[PDB]
Structure formats: structure tokens, C-alpha cells
């Protein structure tokens, strides 16, 4: 038995088995993209035109933009997914998805929670003093809009997910970061100018061009890392001699994973401040907006403009803190979904392409996989998480880490555009 009643009440998206042309998947995606950017232009209906700065920490991983119709962004969806991976991860609620049951259970369920976390975050946001005027009346109104905007995304994700290319989330995030860059550097109060102008003014300010560099450096770094692969020689498909040489995206393995680690921290700095100016200092003493002490403090990413040396210890902890959090969701990405050997089985078996090493059988390869995975999975994340973190010390526009995900998401998005440009020819090989 399960929460199937209300679960069946939660709408979904009509997936046509008709012809969805590449041109259409593309054009679709684009419409989503814009409604997004657009929503990021519209402020939330609120007389208190005065808002307490911003939370320079949540926006990036959340793909949000505080003060707008998407002030909560992907934040909920991520939160939700975080819990699931937590439960269905630490065995607390052991589930063998295999059957379309558990699979659609884990999912449907999470989806719901996403709407739950949709409002929770909303309230938590205003309750964290994200706007300043807690007019119980006005406050209520705001929350409404807020979480409802995030809802639209949840459904816009669904759309892209079944009518276009790539992924909503993935997109969305890349959508935000990219913009955050092109605008921050070149827009109105753009940095490139503030620097360029500062040159003309005759008082060359290295602080105006700085952040822009930070971003190049990161991008360059993050990309290098995104190139590394673990090549797995494959066994001749009945033929003989050296053949395959299958590579694996050693970084993009722990993608969704790190998205969750960073997002965890996102819900801590939010949940701490929230449960600060609305209770007891359980997590930490914020003051000044963000946190200046407590779990919160030790778990607040240092980036923004320039790296902070004036707190070595702070660095160390964070790093290690992130690192481990990454390992975690990685492992929890194992027990669940992730690359599941059961399947990859016959997939390499149909082609009869066992690993280069040896063993051309089902149970054979199946095994060699179940085994090699976990270390891969853990190594990857541990690394990424490191990179991501260090990518923040260095600090960059859009978000060291954000840039990362983006760069990846963007490339996994290029691939998507190709696997499509081709599938648009031989109407069949939709699995090779």
C-alpha cells in the first residue's frame, strides 16, 4: 500500500508516441528556456520594494534568483531528491526499484515531496527574512507566488523532459550561470566596463576585472577535468583482435551527485538562518545576513570575488566537509538508480562485447561491473567535490561550482544534440 490516492491526483505530462522531430524537440526546449529567463525578470508582487541584500550562496545551485517569480528556483526539486537519496539511500527504507513499482514509487513519491518542499522552502524563505516586511497578510501572498513559480518549473522540467532536449534542471542551471556571467561581465552594471571605465578614469581597479579572470581560470580548469576519461578496452564482437576502447565520463559520473552535495549546504545556510531569526541558534549565529559562527559558518562556501586566506581552518573543514558529503550522495547514487549492472548486462551481451580483459558471459561481465563501479563512483565524486570546492576558493563569476556543473551540463547537452541529429536518420537504433 502507498500514498497512491493523492499521488494519482498529482498531474503529469501527456507523452505522445507520435513523431517528435528534432526541429520540434529543439524549438520546444527553447520555449521553456525563455519562459524561464522571463520569470527571472519579473519581481514578486510586494509593496516592500526594500529587500535585505541577497543570499549569495543559494542562487547558483538552485538556478533561482531571489526577489523574482523564481526566487526559489530548482531549490525544492533538489531538496526533495536529496531526502529520497537519503532515505532510499541509507537503507532506512530499502527498495529494489527493478520492478516498475519501486521505480515509479521512488519517483512519483519524490515528485510529490517536491511540491511539499516547494511550499516549505517558500515559507522558510520569507521566514528567513528574505524580504524584510513580515506583514502576515503580505507575507502569505508572497509565499503563494514564490512556491507556485517553482511549481511551473517542475512542470516545465517535465515538458522539456518529454518534449525537447537535455534536461530542465540541467538546462535551468546552465541557463542561470551562463546569464549570470554574460550579464555580470557585460550587462548594465557590467564588470568588464566598470574595469574598462576605471582604466579611462585613470585609476585602474584590479578588483573590477578580477572576478572576470576568476571565471576564465575556472572554466579552463573545470574543462580540463571534464575531459578526463576511464577507457575500457572492449572484447571483439565474435571477431578477433584488439577492438573497442570505450571511455567513461570520469567527472560527469558524479554530476547529479555533487548537485545534491552543494544543494545540501544550500538548505543548511537557509535552514540555519531561518531557524535563527525564528527560534534558537541550533545551527549557527548568522548576523549580517549570512552566518558568522556555528555549523553554518564552518559550512559556508568562501567564493564570490576573491579567495579568503584569513581563515585557513575554515577552508580545511569546508573542503573535507564537502568531500565526504560528495562520497555520500555518490554511494546513495549506487544503492539507487545510477549505472545498474543488471541492465548494462545484455546490453554489452547482445553485441557480445565483454571487457577487454576476458569473460564473455552475462553473469560474468555483470559481475566485473557491479565490482568496478563503486570505486569509480566514489573516486569521481570525491574528486569532483574537491575540484568544485577548490573551484570556489579561487572564486568566480556565476559560481566556481556553478560554472562546473554548467560546463558539464552544457557538454552533455551538446552530445544530446548529436545523438539526436543522427537518430533523425535511421528511425530504429534508438538504443545503440
Amino acid at each position: 500500500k502507498k500514498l497512491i490516492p493523492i499521488l494519482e491526483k498529482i498531474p503529469e505530462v501527456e507523452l505522445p508516441v507520435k513523431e517528435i522531430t528534432f526541429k520540434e524537440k529543439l524549438k520546444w526546449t527553447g520555449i521553456v528556456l525563455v519562459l524561464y529567463f522571463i520569470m527571472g525578470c519579473i519581481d514578486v508582487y510586494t509593496a516592500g520594494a526594500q529587500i535585505p541584500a541577497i543570499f549569495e550562496f543559494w542562487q547558483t545551485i538552485t538556478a533561482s534568483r531571489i526577489g523574482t517569480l523564481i526566487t526559489l528556483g530548482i531549490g525544492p526539486i533538489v531538496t526533495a531528491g536529496i531526502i529520497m537519496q537519503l532515505l532510499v539511500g541509507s537503507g532506512i527504507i530499502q527498495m529494489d526499484l527493478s520492478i516498475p513499482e519501486n521505480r515509479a514509487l521512488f519517483q512519483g513519491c519524490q515528485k510529490l515531496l517536491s511540491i511539499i518542499m516547494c511550499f516549505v522552502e517558500a515559507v522558510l524563505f520569507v521566514g528567513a527574512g528574505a524580504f524584510g516586511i513580515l506583514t502576515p497578510l503580505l507575507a502569505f501572498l508572497v509565499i503563494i507566488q514564490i512556491a507556485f513559480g517553482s511549481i511551473i518549473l517542475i512542470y516545465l522540467d517535465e515538458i522539456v523532459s518529454k518534449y525537447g532536449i537535455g534536461s530542465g534542471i540541467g538546462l535551468f542551471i546552465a541557463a542561470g550561470v551562463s546569464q549570470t556571467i554574460f550579464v555580470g561581465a557585460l550587462g548594465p552594471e557590467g564588470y568588464l566596463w566598470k574595469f574598462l571605465n576605471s582604466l579611462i578614469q585613470g585609476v585602474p581597479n584590479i578588483e573590477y576585472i578580477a572576478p572576470i579572470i576568476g571565471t576564465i581560470i575556472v572554466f579552463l580548469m573545470v574543462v580540463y577535468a571534464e575531459c578526463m576519461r576511464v577507457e575500457i578496452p572492449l572484447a571483439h564482437g565474435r571477431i578477433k583482435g584488439a577492438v573497442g576502447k570505450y571511455p567513461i565520463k570520469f567527472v560527469y559520473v558524479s554530476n547529479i551527485p555533487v548537485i545534491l552535495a552543494a544543494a545540501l549546504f544550500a538548505n543548511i545556510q537557509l535552514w540555519g538562518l531561518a531557524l535563527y531569526r525564528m527560534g534558537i541558534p541550533i545551527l549557527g549565529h548568522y548576523e549580517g545576513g549570512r552566518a558568522v559562527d556555528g555549523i553554518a559558518y564552518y559550512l559556508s562556501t568562501p567564493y564570490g570575488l576573491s579567495s579568503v586566506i584569513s581563515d585557513p581552518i575554515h577552508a580545511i573543514v569546508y573542503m573535507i566537509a564537502m568531500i565526504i558529503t560528495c562520497v555520500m550522495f555518490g554511494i546513495f547514487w549506487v544503492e539507487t538508480t545510477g549505472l545498474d549492472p543488471k541492465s548494462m548486462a545484455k546490453r554489452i551481451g547482445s553485441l557480445g562485447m565483454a571487457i577487454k580483459g576476458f569473460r564473455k558471459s552475462e553473469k560474468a561481465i555483470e559481475h566485473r561491473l557491479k565490482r568496478y563501479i563503486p570505486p569509480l563512483t566514489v573516486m569521481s565524486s570525491a574528486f569532483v567535490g574537491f575540484l568544485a570546492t577548490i573551484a570556489n576558493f579561487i572564486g568566480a563569476l556565476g559560481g566556481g561550482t556553478g560554472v562546473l556543473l554548467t560546463v558539464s551540463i552544457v557538454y552533455r547537452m551538446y552530445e544530446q544534440l548529436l545523438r539526436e541529429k543522427v537518430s533523425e536518420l535511421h528511425p530504429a537504433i534508438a538504443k545503440l
Binding site: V34, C41, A174, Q179, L220, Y224, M228, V230, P374
Partner: protein, 65 residues
């Protein structure tokens, strides 16, 4: 006792990781630049579009605030 075991094991797994972090393919300049290119090219489109929409839509919010 078990504690000793687990300790013995993590040392093992961790070493299994070292193995993964070894079967790694450094990129080949040309290959590298490929990614870098496409990548940026993408962040560029996406970024731009958000600009085309944002910037101006703020020139408004601002000249009517």
C-alpha cells in the same frame, strides 16, 4: 574486533579508488580545445539569450520604478 575488520577494508576500497584515479586519460590539446570550444560556445548562446531578455527588461523596471 569488527572495527579492525572494517578498518582493514576501507583501506582496501580506498586503494581500489586509487586504481580508478589511475586509469585516467589526460586530454590531447586538440581534444581539449574541442570541448573548451563547444562548451563555451554553448554557455555563450544560453548566456546571451538571458542577456537579450534581462538587460533591457531591467532598463524598463528601472525607468518606471
Amino acid at each position: 574486533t569488527d572495527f579492525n575488520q572494517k578498518i582493514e577494508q576501507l583501506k582496501e576500497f580506498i586503494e581500489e579508488c586509487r586504481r580508478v584515479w589511475l586509469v585516467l586519460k589526460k586530454p590531447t590539446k586538440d581534444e581539449y580545445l574541442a570541448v573548451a570550444k563547444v562548451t563555451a560556445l554553448g554557455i555563450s548562446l544560453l548566456g546571451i539569450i538571458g542577456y537579450i531578455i534581462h538587460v533591457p527588461a531591467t532598463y524598463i523596471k528601472g525607468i518606471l520604478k
